[PDB]
Design a protein around this ligand. Structure first.
Ligand SMILES: *[C@@H]1O[C@H](CO)[C@@H](O)[C@H](O)[C@H]1NC(C)=O
Lengths: 49, 66
């Protein structure tokens, strides 16, 4: 649900769109995520690993 | 995530793409206020072959009729 559950009712949303919102919040346009989605996922999976 | 009109991907400038079941609109995130997907609401950057989940629809040009 993103950050919506901390304010009012929880509202569902697909994870890639939430990640696009999170990128947009730091000054990078969302089209950067979608065109580099798979790669980014890998960099996350390694980071936890 | 994105709408492909003619070999090009369109992303919302500020808002999300929603659909009632037959047609597509663009709206805000904290309040329901649908609008018509024109060339102002959206910006184009892509090639319509890399986004995962792109859908087919038509955008509207406010200058062609005039
Ligand atoms: C979207 O439109 C293009 C060109 O009109 C077509 O090649 C493609 O198959 C369409 N995709 C879907 C899912 O209908």
């Amino acid at each position: 649900s993103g950050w919506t559950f901390g304010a009012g009712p929880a509202l569902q949303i697909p994870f890639p769109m939430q990640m696009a919102y999170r990128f947009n919040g730091i000054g990078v346009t969302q089209n950067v995520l979608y065109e580099n989605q798979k790669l980014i996922a890998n960099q996350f999976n390694s980071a936890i690993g | 995530p994105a709408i492909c009109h003619d070999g090009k991907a369109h992303f919302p400038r500020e808002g999300v793409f929603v659909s009632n079941g037959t047609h597509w609109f663009v709206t805000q995130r904290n309040f329901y206020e649908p609008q018509i997907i024109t060339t102002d609401n959206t910006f184009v950057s892509g090639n319509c072959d890399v986004v995962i989940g792109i859908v087919n629809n038509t955008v509207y040009d406010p200058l062609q009729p005039e």
